[PDB]
């Protein structure tokens, strides 16, 4: 919601209140998404001020507030800051911002991150270039300096983040994307690579000093039709765990495929169909393991632009014999979302 627009500085304060609930067999510890209340909310703001007629300053902050906690000690479990950055966009040169923001490889993975609830599996947060990250300096350029419509590129610089965890840690690195949008087609390629840190190298699963991720997208988005596909691979970057040996680390290699098919009816119904398959390769002592695999059937029914509800169903293809001990049961999400 645009709560303010005076003296060329508009502030968009927005939020969400998602009544949500998962359904999985038993206590669902063996299910794709889990079982239980999953209600949460959001709050944030994106500001934009015009320094002049070419230069624009902008800032954004988004925060997730969990609603499925009690007002006891667990109150904060899950609350986190999702985005926080600032920048200046200028004429045709391009934009530059810095802070907690999405990694460039997300640009590609973005194409398939359209499911009602689930999906987006390979875009782990705090995992180098595929999801939200801390301290990334990003430079994007539009229409190749205005010369070519639809030709976009960006180069990101990931700063080293040595945290308490190997999972949330990352060394420094660089990445970049290139996308061309035309008619209702989009084609993307993005890649990045950064140093793994000592703690990361110290983990039992995964071996290397350089983690690199890359993926490409293709999409036909026009005339109530959304079709998109993603494919990517990674070296020592997808976090994994062996539930049996109680070991953790990263998959040495992974072949990722994401597919989406969605149609937007006029009356508000927007069914969804998708396929997700992530397979780790060269996992020590195991070899090839499916980290994710399933089919999705879903439907979001938008009332107006500030209301909707959706049902998401995950036909979990993962089998019980999974080596890493991944869950094999299905999950069903049922949400009702109010926003502004």
């Amino acid at each position: 919601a645009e709560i303010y627009n005076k003296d060329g500085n508009k502030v968009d304060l927005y939020g969400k209140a998602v009544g949500l609930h998962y359904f999985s067999k038993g206590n669902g510890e063996n299910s794709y998404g889990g079982n239980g209340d999953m209600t949460y909310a959001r709050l944030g703001f994106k500001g934009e001020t015009q320094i002049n007629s070419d230069l624009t300053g902008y800032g954004q902050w988004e925060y997730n507030f969990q609603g499925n906690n009690s007002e006891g000690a667990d109150a904060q479990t899950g609350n986190k800051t999702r985005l926080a950055f600032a920048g200046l966009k200028y004429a045709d040169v391009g934009s530059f911002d810095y802070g907690r923001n999405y990694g460039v490889v997300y640009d590609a993975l973005g194409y398939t991150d359209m499911l009602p609830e689930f999906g987006g599996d390979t875009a782990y947060s705090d995992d180098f270039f595929v999801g939200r990250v801390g301290g990334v300096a990003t430079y994007r350029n539009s229409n190749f300096f205005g010369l070519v419509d639809g030709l976009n590129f960006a180069v990101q610089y990931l700063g080293k983040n040595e945290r308490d965890t190997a999972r949330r840690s990352n060394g420094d690195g660089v990445g970049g994307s290139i996308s061309y949008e035309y008619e209702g087609f989009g084609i993307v390629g993005a890649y990045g690579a950064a140093d793994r840190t000592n703690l990361q190298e110290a983990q039992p699963l995964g071996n290397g000093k350089k983690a690199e991720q890359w993926a490409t997208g293709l999409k036909y988005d026009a005339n109530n039709i959304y079709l998109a596909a993603n494919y990517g691979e990674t070296r020592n970057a997808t976090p994994i765990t062996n539930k049996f040996t109680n070991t953790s680390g990263f998959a040495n290699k992974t072949q990722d495929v994401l597919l989406v098919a969605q149609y937007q009816f006029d009356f508000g119904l927007r069914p969804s169909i998708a396929y997700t398959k992530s397979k780790a390769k060269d996992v020590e002592g195991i070899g090839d393991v499916d980290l994710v695999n399933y089919f999705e059937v879903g439907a979001t029914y938008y009332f107006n632009k500030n209301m909707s509800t959706y049902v998401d169903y995950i036909i979990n293809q993962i089998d019980s014999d999974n080596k890493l001990g991944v869950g094999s049961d299905d999950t069903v999400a049922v949400g009702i979302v109010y926003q502004f």
Copy 2:
């Protein structure tokens, strides 16, 4: 405050900044409410969008921010999300929302929850149907489908919540209320019951597999006069602790009485008078124990609609010989509240 109302979607962003302080003898660990700085703030938003002329989507999120903490490690102590849900209200059929919201038995207890600071004693949060709860689906209906003015009812479905604590946990259950408002009178009856979970059954105090709460209210609210009374009982649901045996659990039974008497002067002064008495029965090895007992004398002086101050005094009737070790000293709250 209504910061936005465009295209039939009004957003009410509100808050509080309560400068507060308690006064009790000594360090007050033996006092009703404690002693010290109790300053806090609130922030939230309730949105409402008109899907059409019968259907309305709405959402709400409220968060408590504690101000009596240092900026050190204790910073977050007390911060919690108080409410978070979403729903659709429709024509005369009624409303339906889901998320973190008040339990139906609160509908009754609401009548007496009007004190300047204290009061509301029996409406514990995260305690089945008497206070705020997680994952409750609620259906309310107004004026009996519009047929009878003042006749209201609601049926709530409490979802199972297996948390780290027995106190904050709850099995699944159902509850409902019925209220009739007329002239300036109100009469309410509400009841609910749900399964106690293993962890709860596992506690030393309290025995049963089903916890059920119920209460009724009566109130005369009109012409600057507010008079209300509540009475209820519970089976294995009111959380209790024996400070001496260092044991916890739930009271097998409790007889609750709440009484309020308040008058609204024209110039802003609104004195308060109240009586609260909660007694546990069948407490193992003890029998009958008063969990709460006192008289209250208070007064809120509202300047305008965004300012007030109040003094609340609790004449603590609990004696020193209390078996469960409940505090016996008095407490005085003195707040100054700004809001919007």
Copy 3:
């Protein structure tokens, strides 16, 4: 940003999104400010309602949200409530508010707290009267009841706060300030003293039962020129640590000097020059130790009123032979700030 002004109640909801990063040699554990991503954000609101033509109610809440955390367990590390209070300002009598607010001795230290990033060294939070504190009742009076322009005074009452930590704890005390502003000159004197608590007295470093702080300021602020100086001293109040003995407590005495020199160019550039020196005296087994010492060179370039960037450089004068083990390396901050 003033998101609302109706019926004489204006609400100013504001925020920040600071993309920030420190630069120090090595991992910088021996540097002044540290090394790494330091991105954060702010959110808050100050409200003001006119009770009538003399009386005004007002409230404020400010919260710091850290952006340099991962979305993992460390998510909340650093989030804190910075301010939270409420009051009534009246005619010429003066204002009175209560809650989490700045201590009076800050009034003096304020003069030198103008650096782009660093600076303000001696105004520790949760440290009696020099920084933000919990439960302080403050009374300020303007222009000596309107009789003398520029003559201002305030008397603060610090409530006892017995927290988990000696550092964040404080006994009760009183403080007050006196400031006279004229032409573009300002002269301030402020002082306070309060009881140290048992836990504080219990610490190895620092001996006394009464902690007292005081400081004075002088400033020439007019015609794009800002020049300010501060000098103060303290008894058993500045928190200190001996990195080698792994001991903590408070400096028995400290001589603090702060100096600032800044000029505001018309086009937006605002260079900064400053000197900071805090020296502890009578530190057990050591004697005199510099807690802080350096020169600063900085520059903030404001685009418009909602955008800026700055570079701050700390020429760290602290030597390696520091007895308390204080860091000796330099630090460089580079921020880009969007606000509203």
